Each structure stands twice: as C-alpha cells, then as structure tokens.
Amino acid sequence: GFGGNDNFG
C-alpha cells in the first residue's frame, strides 16, 4: 500500500 510495499509473485 501507500507508504509501504506491493509484491506480485
């Protein structure tokens, strides 16, 4: 999210 992480695997 905003201010954090987005991980696609």
Short mmCIF file of N, CA and C in Angstrom, two decimals:
data_model
loop_
_atom_site.label_atom_id
_atom_site.label_comp_id
_atom_site.label_asym_id
_atom_site.label_seq_id
_atom_site.Cartn_x
_atom_site.Cartn_y
_atom_site.Cartn_z
N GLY A 1 0.76 -1.23 0.00
CA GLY A 1 0.00 0.00 0.00
C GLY A 1 0.80 1.30 0.00
N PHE A 2 0.08 2.43 -0.01
CA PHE A 2 0.70 3.75 0.07
C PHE A 2 1.60 3.79 1.31
N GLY A 3 2.87 4.21 1.11
CA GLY A 3 3.83 4.24 2.19
C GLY A 3 4.48 2.90 2.52
N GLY A 4 4.15 1.86 1.77
CA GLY A 4 4.62 0.50 2.01
C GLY A 4 4.92 -0.25 0.72
N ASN A 5 4.67 -1.56 0.69
CA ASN A 5 5.12 -2.41 -0.43
C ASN A 5 3.96 -3.14 -1.11
N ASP A 6 4.15 -3.40 -2.41
CA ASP A 6 3.23 -4.17 -3.25
C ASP A 6 4.04 -5.26 -3.99
N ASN A 7 3.76 -6.54 -3.66
CA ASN A 7 4.55 -7.70 -4.09
C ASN A 7 3.68 -8.63 -4.93
N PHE A 8 4.10 -8.88 -6.18
CA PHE A 8 3.40 -9.78 -7.11
C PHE A 8 4.30 -10.97 -7.47
N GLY A 9 3.88 -12.19 -7.09
CA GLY A 9 4.64 -13.41 -7.34
C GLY A 9 3.80 -14.68 -7.42
#
